[PDB]
Structure formats: C-alpha cells, structure tokens
Coordinates of C-alpha atoms and ligand atoms in Angstrom, one line a residue:
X20 CA 13.2 25.6 -5.2
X21 CA 12.9 25.7 -1.3
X22 CA 9.3 25.5 -0.2
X23 CA 9.9 26.4 3.5
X24 CA 12.3 28.4 5.7
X25 CA 13.6 25.7 8.2
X26 CA 11.9 26.0 11.6
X27 CA 9.0 28.1 10.4
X28 CA 5.5 27.7 11.8
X29 CA 2.7 26.7 9.4
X30 CA -1.0 26.8 10.3
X31 CA -3.3 24.2 8.7
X32 CA -7.0 24.7 7.6
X33 CA -8.3 23.8 11.1
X34 CA -5.9 26.3 12.8
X35 CA -3.5 23.6 14.2
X36 CA 0.1 24.9 14.3
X37 CA 3.1 22.9 13.1
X38 CA 6.8 23.5 12.8
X39 CA 8.9 22.4 9.8
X40 CA 12.3 20.6 10.1
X41 CA 14.8 18.9 7.8
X42 CA 14.1 16.7 4.8
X43 CA 13.9 13.0 5.4
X44 CA 16.4 10.5 3.9
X45 CA 18.3 12.9 1.7
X48 CA 12.1 10.5 -1.4
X49 CA 11.0 14.0 -2.8
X50 CA 9.6 17.0 -1.0
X51 CA 8.9 15.6 2.5
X52 CA 10.2 17.1 5.7
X53 CA 10.2 16.2 9.4
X54 CA 7.4 18.0 11.2
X55 CA 6.2 18.4 14.8
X56 CA 3.6 20.4 16.8
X57 CA 4.5 24.0 17.3
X58 CA 6.6 24.5 20.4
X59 CA 9.7 26.4 21.5
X60 CA 12.0 23.4 20.6
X61 CA 13.3 22.7 17.0
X62 CA 11.9 19.9 15.0
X63 CA 14.2 16.9 15.9
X64 CA 15.3 13.8 14.0
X65 CA 12.9 11.8 16.1
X66 CA 10.0 13.9 15.0
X67 CA 6.6 12.1 14.9
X68 CA 5.2 13.7 11.8
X69 CA 6.1 14.6 8.3
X70 CA 4.9 17.4 6.0
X71 CA 4.5 16.6 2.3
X72 CA 4.5 19.7 0.1
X73 CA 3.8 20.1 -3.7
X74 CA 2.5 22.8 -5.9
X75 CA -1.2 23.4 -5.5
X76 CA -1.8 22.3 -9.2
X77 CA -0.1 18.9 -8.4
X78 CA -2.8 16.3 -9.3
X79 CA -1.4 13.4 -7.1
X80 CA -1.2 15.4 -3.9
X81 CA -4.8 16.5 -4.2
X82 CA -5.9 12.9 -4.9
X83 CA -3.9 11.6 -1.9
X84 CA -5.3 14.4 0.3
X85 CA -8.8 13.5 -0.7
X86 CA -8.2 9.9 0.2
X87 CA -6.8 10.8 3.6
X88 CA -9.7 13.2 4.4
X89 CA -12.4 10.7 3.3
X90 CA -11.0 7.4 4.7
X91 CA -8.0 8.1 7.0
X92 CA -9.3 10.4 9.8
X93 CA -7.8 9.3 13.2
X94 CA -11.3 8.4 14.6
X95 CA -12.6 6.7 11.5
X96 CA -9.6 4.3 11.7
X97 CA -9.8 3.8 15.5
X98 CA -13.6 3.1 15.2
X99 CA -12.8 0.3 12.6
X100 CA -10.0 -1.2 14.8
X101 CA -12.4 -1.7 17.7
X102 CA -15.4 -3.0 15.6
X103 CA -13.3 -5.6 13.6
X104 CA -11.1 -6.4 16.7
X105 CA -7.7 -5.6 15.2
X106 CA -4.3 -5.0 17.0
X107 CA -3.9 -1.9 14.7
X108 CA -4.6 -0.9 11.1
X109 CA -1.9 0.1 8.7
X110 CA -3.5 3.1 7.1
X111 CA -1.4 6.1 7.9
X112 CA -3.0 8.8 10.0
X113 CA -3.9 12.2 8.5
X114 CA -3.2 15.2 10.9
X115 CA -4.1 18.2 8.8
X116 CA -3.5 20.1 5.6
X117 CA -3.5 23.6 4.1
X118 CA -2.2 26.1 1.6
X119 CA 1.2 27.7 1.8
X120 CA 2.5 30.5 -0.4
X121 CA 6.1 31.1 -1.2
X122 CA 7.8 33.4 -3.8
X123 CA 4.4 34.1 -5.4
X124 CA 3.7 30.4 -6.0
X125 CA 0.9 28.4 -4.3
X126 CA 1.7 25.1 -2.6
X127 CA -0.4 22.4 -0.9
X128 CA 0.7 20.7 2.3
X129 CA -0.3 17.7 4.3
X130 CA 0.7 16.5 7.8
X131 CA 1.1 12.7 8.2
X132 CA 2.5 10.2 10.6
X133 CA 6.3 9.7 10.4
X134 CA 7.4 6.1 9.9
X135 CA 10.7 4.2 10.1
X136 CA 12.2 2.1 7.2
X137 CA 10.4 1.0 4.0
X138 CA 10.2 -2.8 3.4
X139 CA 12.3 -2.7 0.2
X140 CA 15.4 -1.5 2.1
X141 CA 15.1 -4.3 4.6
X142 CA 14.3 -6.8 1.9
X143 CA 17.6 -6.0 0.0
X144 CA 19.6 -6.1 3.2
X145 CA 18.2 -9.6 3.8
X146 CA 19.5 -10.6 0.2
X147 CA 16.0 -10.2 -1.4
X148 CA 14.2 -12.9 0.7
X149 CA 11.5 -12.7 3.3
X150 CA 10.8 -15.8 5.4
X151 CA 7.5 -17.7 4.9
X152 CA 6.6 -16.4 8.5
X153 CA 7.3 -12.8 7.5
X154 CA 5.5 -13.0 4.2
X155 CA 2.3 -14.5 5.8
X156 CA 2.3 -11.9 8.7
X157 CA 2.8 -9.0 6.2
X158 CA 0.1 -10.3 4.0
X159 CA -2.5 -10.7 6.7
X160 CA -1.9 -7.1 7.7
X161 CA -2.1 -5.9 4.1
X162 CA -5.4 -7.8 3.7
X163 CA -6.7 -5.8 6.7
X164 CA -5.6 -2.6 5.0
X165 CA -7.1 -3.5 1.5
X166 CA -10.4 -4.5 3.0
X167 CA -10.5 -1.2 4.8
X168 CA -9.7 1.0 1.8
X169 CA -12.0 -1.1 -0.5
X170 CA -14.9 -0.7 1.9
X171 CA -14.1 3.1 1.8
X172 CA -14.5 3.2 -2.0
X173 CA -10.7 3.1 -3.0
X174 CA -8.2 0.7 -4.5
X175 CA -4.4 1.2 -4.2
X176 CA -3.2 -0.3 -7.4
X177 CA 0.5 -0.2 -6.4
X178 CA 1.2 -2.4 -3.4
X179 CA 4.9 -3.2 -3.1
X180 CA 7.7 -3.3 -0.6
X181 CA 8.8 0.4 -1.1
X182 CA 5.2 1.6 -0.3
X183 CA 5.2 -0.5 3.0
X184 CA 6.6 1.4 5.9
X185 CA 7.2 0.2 9.5
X186 CA 5.8 2.0 12.5
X187 CA 8.7 4.3 13.8
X188 CA 8.3 3.0 17.4
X189 CA 7.0 -0.6 16.6
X190 CA 8.8 -2.8 14.0
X191 CA 5.9 -5.4 13.9
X192 CA 3.4 -2.9 12.5
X193 CA 3.4 -2.3 8.7
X194 CA 1.6 0.6 6.9
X195 CA 0.7 1.0 3.2
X196 CA 1.5 4.5 1.9
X197 CA 1.2 6.5 -1.4
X198 CA -2.4 7.2 -2.5
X199 CA -1.4 9.8 -5.2
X200 CA -2.7 7.5 -7.9
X201 CA -5.3 5.6 -5.7
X202 CA -8.5 5.1 -7.5
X203 CA -12.0 5.6 -6.2
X204 CA -13.6 2.5 -7.8
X205 CA -16.9 2.8 -6.0
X206 CA -18.0 6.5 -5.6
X207 CA -21.3 6.7 -3.7
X208 CA -21.5 2.8 -3.9
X209 CA -21.7 2.7 -7.7
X210 CA -19.0 0.4 -9.2
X211 CA -17.1 1.8 -12.2
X212 CA -17.6 -0.1 -15.5
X213 CA -15.1 -2.5 -17.1
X214 CA -13.4 0.3 -19.1
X215 CA -10.5 2.8 -19.1
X216 CA -10.4 6.1 -17.1
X217 CA -9.4 9.5 -18.5
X222 CA -0.7 1.5 -14.6
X223 CA 1.0 0.7 -11.2
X224 CA 4.4 -0.9 -11.2
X225 CA 4.9 -3.2 -14.2
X226 CA 6.3 -6.3 -12.5
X227 CA 3.5 -6.4 -9.9
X228 CA 0.5 -4.8 -11.6
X229 CA -2.8 -6.6 -12.4
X230 CA -4.0 -8.2 -15.6
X231 CA -6.8 -5.6 -15.6
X232 CA -4.4 -2.7 -15.5
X233 CA -2.4 -4.4 -18.3
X234 CA -5.7 -4.6 -20.4
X235 CA -6.1 -0.8 -20.0
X236 CA -9.1 -0.8 -17.7
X237 CA -9.3 1.0 -14.3
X238 CA -8.1 -1.0 -11.3
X239 CA -10.6 -2.8 -9.0
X240 CA -10.5 -4.9 -5.9
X241 CA -9.4 -8.1 -7.5
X242 CA -6.4 -6.3 -9.0
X243 CA -5.2 -5.2 -5.6
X244 CA -5.3 -8.8 -4.3
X245 CA -3.6 -10.1 -7.5
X246 CA -0.8 -7.5 -7.0
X247 CA -0.4 -8.7 -3.4
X248 CA -0.1 -12.2 -4.9
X249 CA 2.9 -11.3 -7.1
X250 CA 4.5 -9.5 -4.1
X251 CA 4.4 -12.7 -2.0
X252 CA 6.2 -14.7 -4.7
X253 CA 8.8 -11.9 -5.1
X254 CA 9.3 -11.8 -1.4
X255 CA 9.5 -15.6 -0.9
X256 CA 11.8 -16.4 -3.8
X257 CA 13.6 -13.1 -4.8
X258 CA 12.2 -13.4 -8.4
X259 CA 9.2 -13.3 -10.7
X260 CA 9.3 -15.1 -14.1
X261 CA 8.8 -11.9 -16.2
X262 CA 11.5 -9.8 -14.4
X263 CA 13.9 -9.8 -17.4
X264 CA 11.2 -8.5 -19.8
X265 CA 9.9 -5.4 -18.0
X266 CA 10.6 -3.0 -20.9
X267 CA 8.0 -5.1 -22.8
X268 CA 4.5 -4.8 -21.2
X269 CA 2.8 -7.2 -23.7
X270 CA 5.3 -9.9 -22.7
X271 CA 4.6 -9.3 -19.0
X272 CA 0.8 -9.4 -19.6
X273 CA 1.1 -12.6 -21.7
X274 CA 3.1 -14.3 -18.9
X275 CA 0.7 -13.2 -16.3
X276 CA -2.4 -14.3 -18.3
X277 CA -0.8 -17.8 -19.0
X278 CA 0.3 -18.3 -15.4
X279 CA -3.2 -17.3 -14.1
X280 CA -4.7 -19.9 -16.4
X281 CA -2.2 -22.6 -15.1
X282 CA -1.4 -21.7 -11.5
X283 CA 0.4 -25.1 -10.9
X284 CA 2.9 -24.1 -13.7
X285 CA 3.6 -20.8 -11.8
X286 CA 4.3 -22.7 -8.6
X287 CA 6.6 -25.0 -10.7
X288 CA 8.4 -22.1 -12.2
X289 CA 8.9 -20.0 -9.0
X290 CA 9.5 -22.6 -6.4
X291 CA 11.8 -25.6 -6.6
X292 CA 10.7 -29.2 -7.1
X293 CA 7.2 -30.0 -5.7
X294 CA 8.0 -27.8 -2.6
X295 CA 5.7 -24.9 -3.3
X296 CA 3.9 -23.2 -0.3
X297 CA 0.3 -24.5 -0.7
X298 CA -1.4 -21.4 0.7
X299 CA 0.1 -19.3 -2.1
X300 CA -1.4 -21.4 -4.8
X301 CA -4.7 -21.4 -2.9
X302 CA -4.6 -17.6 -2.6
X303 CA -4.1 -17.3 -6.3
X304 CA -6.9 -19.6 -7.1
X305 CA -9.3 -17.7 -4.9
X306 CA -8.4 -14.4 -6.5
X307 CA -8.8 -16.0 -9.9
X308 CA -12.5 -16.7 -9.2
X309 CA -13.3 -13.0 -8.7
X310 CA -15.3 -11.0 -11.2
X311 CA -14.2 -7.4 -12.0
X312 CA -17.0 -5.9 -9.9
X313 CA -17.1 -8.6 -7.2
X314 CA -16.6 -8.1 -3.5
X315 CA -13.7 -10.4 -2.3
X316 CA -14.3 -12.7 0.6
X317 CA -11.4 -11.2 2.6
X318 CA -11.9 -13.5 5.7
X319 CA -11.5 -16.6 3.4
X320 CA -8.2 -15.2 2.0
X321 CA -7.0 -14.5 5.6
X322 CA -8.0 -18.1 6.5
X323 CA -5.9 -19.5 3.6
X324 CA -2.9 -17.5 4.9
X325 CA -3.7 -18.7 8.5
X326 CA -3.6 -22.3 7.3
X327 CA 0.0 -21.6 6.1
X328 CA 1.0 -20.3 9.5
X329 CA -0.4 -23.5 11.1
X330 CA 1.5 -25.6 8.5
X331 CA 4.9 -24.1 9.7
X332 CA 4.0 -24.6 13.4
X333 CA 3.2 -20.9 14.0
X334 CA 0.1 -18.6 14.6
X335 CA -1.0 -15.0 14.0
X336 CA 1.1 -13.6 16.9
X337 CA 1.6 -10.3 15.0
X338 CA 5.4 -10.9 14.7
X339 CA 6.8 -9.7 11.3
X340 CA 10.1 -11.3 12.3
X341 CA 12.4 -8.8 10.4
Ligands
F8Y401 C1 12.8 9.7 8.3 C2 12.5 8.6 7.9 C3 12.0 7.3 7.4 N1 11.3 7.5 6.1 C4 11.9 7.1 4.9 O1 13.1 6.8 4.9 C5 11.1 7.0 3.7 C6 10.8 5.5 3.3 N2 9.8 7.7 3.7 C7 9.2 8.1 2.4 C8 8.2 7.1 1.9 C9 9.2 8.1 4.9 N3 8.0 8.6 4.9 C10 7.4 8.9 6.0 N4 6.1 9.4 6.1 C11 5.1 9.4 5.1 C12 5.4 9.7 3.7 C13 4.4 9.6 2.8 F1 4.7 9.8 1.5 C14 3.1 9.3 3.1 O2 2.2 9.2 2.2 C15 2.8 9.1 4.5 F2 1.6 8.8 4.8 C16 3.8 9.1 5.4 N5 8.0 8.8 7.2 C17 9.2 8.4 7.3 C18 9.9 8.0 6.1

C-alpha cells in the first residue's frame, strides 16, 4: 500500500519542505529524501524518510527518542564538550503527519547512511580484525554513554544496526530506537522488574530474566558482539530456538569468564582486553552508572598491545 506519490513534496511540523524519492535497498518503508527543490531526489540523496501508520508504536517511540536526545545542536554541543571527532547518534531533521487514502501516517526525516556492518562482516567471511573491533567498540561506547546520559538504553546493539557514514567509512552510527527504553525518566531509575527482548544471541542476562533493560545490559550486549566479530561465533549459536539454554550458557560463562575465553578463542591466545571488559561489566549493579572511561581505557590498552592507537581508522 504506497504511502507516497514519488517526487511529492511533504511539509513537516516546523514547515520545512522535503521531496520523496525511491525506496532504499529494495529494509521496510524507508525512502530516499532531500530538501525541496526543482531537481528530483537522486540516488546520492542525503536524507531518508521513514513512514509508518500513525498507530505504529515503534515509530512513535523512535521519534520521541530522536526529539529528546538527537537534535542536531544537542549532539554538536556534546561533541565539543567531550572533545570527540564525531558522535554516532543519527541526526533528526524533522517529522510530521501525512494522510493518504483516508489513512493517517507518521513520517520522520533522518540522515542517509551507507552500508550496515552486517553486510561488510559477511563479505569479510564473518570476521573483523582486532583493530576494527576495538575502534568500533570505542565509538559504540561513546554512543551508549550519550544515550544513557539522555535517559535511554538501546537493548539491541548488533552489526545490522550499525551503519557507516555515507561520505566517511571510518564513522559508525547506531540506528533503530523503535524498542529503545527510557530507563531513567526525569532521573528516576526503573525498578528491577518487567515492563508492560532484543536479539536472542546478543541480548543481556537481565532481558533473559524478563526485566527491563538497563545500562549494564547494553554493555553486556556489546561484549557478545565483540566475540562474534572477532571469532565468527558464539557458544550458544546452535541453540537460539531455546532461550533457557541461551540464558543458562550466558549465566555460566559470566560466572567463569576464563572458560568463555577458552571456549571462544584458541589455546591461551585470547585478547586480554575482552576478558577485562567482561569482568568490569560483571561488577555493575542493575541501577549502577558504568564507568565508561575505564571501559574505553581497557580497549585502548588493547590497541597499545597490537602496536596501534585510537587514530579513528575502522579499517574495513
Ligand atoms: C541507501 C542506502 C543504504 N542504507 C541501507 O542499505 C540500509 C542498511 N538502511 C536501513 C537500516 C539505511 N538506512 C538509512 N537511514 C536510516 C534508517 C533508519 F531506520 C534510521 O533509524 C536512521 F536513523 C537512518 N540510510 C541508508 C541505508
């Protein structure tokens, strides 16, 4: 059911005008978009428009995240004060309401990106280098600190939700906030309890226990991503139709991190920073603020160990 006539001009709530183009990648109802002009929206368009029915829960949740935490100035303010090269939270350009065929739709204008990391990962035979993984993880730590300090957790960090800057292949961005969770509304942390799951292979022990995600869970998810990226595998990958198996493995390997290193890496040739990252996350209570700079330090020690430095090069 077509939501737009191709090339039509749509006006957002702040009266900014946009033109709609073709769908991206033959990834659901997302289309190329540009500023209104006399030219057609081209295949090098710098924005996308996401469109779902107005009763779509996830789009409303995602829009609320973008309006509260991803305003171009809010981001740029943070980049200067923390002294970052960039921050991989996608920019929000506007949103509005669009009727078609007597149905109401919601739309949101975002940055357009290049390729997702999962596509690149599979093309490199399901491996990322130790250099790539550390540089990705440093930048993801910057993103998680930001969203966490703005009252949200992601709950679903993975290669397919990591997109490259369209014009810069060394900058990575975390997308999909449709099931993001505001863990700390008005600074009051949610209780250790359910709310009225993420991706099974990567999700947190907390999520497996049926409680709402928190900050430690995000860090833990990143942890499993690093092992998947480094080795091409996780121990529980043949049992993903059985959540209790996956939880059991995760609980046992959290309690004995050395056995996880033994299982996932050969020999006694496990990258030490990974074990250290996991131990640090293990110390966090459900409500506790992570010490993000100590986690970045642990990763930076890994870069030093391979004769490199945080030069921002993702090396893909
Ligand atoms: C064209 C092209 C490349 N391209 C793809 O192939 C795939 C991987 N996707 C879908 C994820 C893309 N998505 C975006 N923008 C975007 C989408 C969001 F859902 C979102 O929340 C957001 F902030 C930005 N630009 C380009 C691509």
